[PDB]
Amino acid sequence: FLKVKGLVKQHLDSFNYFVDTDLKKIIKANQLILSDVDPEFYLKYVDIRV
Amino acid sequence: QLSDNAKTLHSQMMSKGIGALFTQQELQKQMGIGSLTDLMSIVQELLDKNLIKLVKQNDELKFQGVLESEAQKKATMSAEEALVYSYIEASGREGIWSKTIKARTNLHQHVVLKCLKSLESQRYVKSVKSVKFPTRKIYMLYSLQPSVD
DNA sequence: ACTTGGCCATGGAGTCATTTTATCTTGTGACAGAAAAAGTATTACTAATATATGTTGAAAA
DNA sequence: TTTTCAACATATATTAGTAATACTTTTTCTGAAATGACTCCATGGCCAAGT
């Protein structure tokens, strides 16, 4: 049990789940910032990497 | 027909147009011959063709015949002023104050400024400093200068 | 003379609000929009330069 | 075709004239527990008119 899945895995997994996933969520929430002006503009995020 | 129903529907406006208070039911009061969409399709197009005229007040919507100078005038104007200039020329004698346009038009100040500058160069508007405090610069049609003192 | 109504004052009563709740530690840690003033950037000059940039292109390899 | 030249142009800081226009900055100028009170009600009593 402890050998492969480690003693202190709580702080690891949640982190390793964060960087590998919830970033690709947060930006998927707000991927477009657009002012009110110049009706042609947009700023479209796509991917996040660390 | 675009031209026929345009010219004969312009005829009731140029003749009477039931004053300012004319509503769409008042069109059926005069011409009820037109089917629902037939009269409304050419309504919409003649506003797109700037021939009929609409006013937003009371119940239903008011209508009047275009002077055709204001027609091509606003057609020359941008989409900003297209409502904004028309929205302001509906302010009538007392005009309107700038910053309250944003809550009405849902725009910045920066975006409404430059077109107001155009209408200044276009001379269809003028800054009016009235009895109330001169932080306002309320705007009315340059065509008139009415006020309360 | 003798009863009622209304009336105003007062007593309860169920209403809402202020300040405590232990030492010794011992690190730690100003709005904006506008006006006006003021000021500078241009846009013509020669004009000596020496880089840069390019493009192109022409000529050589 | 590539590389060479090279040439060819073109800004480039200097200096004043301008004068004029434009364009930005600046500097103002105002749209848990337990008492405290608090009100909300109910009666006592007093003053009065019909009796």
Swiss-Prot record, chain A:
It comes from the Eukaryota. Transmembrane segments: none annotated. Signal peptide: none annotated. Disulfide bonds: none annotated. It is found in: Nucleus. Present with 1950 molecules/cell in log phase SD medium. Belongs to the RNA polymerase beta chain family. DNA-dependent RNA polymerase catalyzes the transcription of DNA into RNA using the four ribonucleoside triphosphates as substrates. Second largest core component of RNA polymerase III which synthesizes small RNAs, such as 5S rRNA and tRNAs. Proposed to contribute to the polymerase catalytic activity and forms the polymerase active center together with the largest subunit. Pol III is composed of mobile elements and RPC2 is part of the core element with the central large cleft and probably a clamp element that moves to open and close the cleft. Component of the RNA polymerase III (Pol III) complex consisting of 17 subunits. This is DNA-directed RNA polymerase III subunit RPC2. The lineage of its organism: Eukaryota, Fungi, Dikarya, Ascomycota, Saccharomycotina. The chain holds residues 51 to 100 of 1149 of the full protein.
Curated annotation (Swiss-Prot), chain B:
GO terms for biological process: termination of RNA polymerase III transcription; transcription by RNA polymerase III; transcription initiation at RNA polymerase III promoter; tRNA transcription by RNA polymerase III. Keywords: DNA-directed RNA polymerase, Nucleus, Transcription. The keyword Nucleus applies. The keyword Transcription applies. It is found in: Nucleus. GO terms for cellular component: cytoplasm; mitochondrion; nucleoplasm; nucleus; RNA polymerase III complex. Component of the RNA polymerase III (Pol III) complex consisting of 17 subunits. Interacts with BRF1/TDS4. Belongs to the eukaryotic RPC34/RPC39 RNA polymerase subunit family. DNA-dependent RNA polymerase catalyzes the transcription of DNA into RNA using the four ribonucleoside triphosphates as substrates. Specific peripheric component of RNA polymerase III which synthesizes small RNAs, such as 5S rRNA and tRNAs. Involved in recruitment of Pol III to the preinitiation complex. Involved in the configuration of an initiation-competent form of RNA polymerase. This is DNA-directed RNA polymerase III subunit RPC6. It comes from Saccharomyces cerevisiae (strain ATCC 204508 / S288c). The lineage of its organism: Eukaryota, Fungi, Dikarya, Ascomycota, Saccharomycotina. The gene is RPC34. The chain holds residues 10 to 158 of 317 of the full protein.
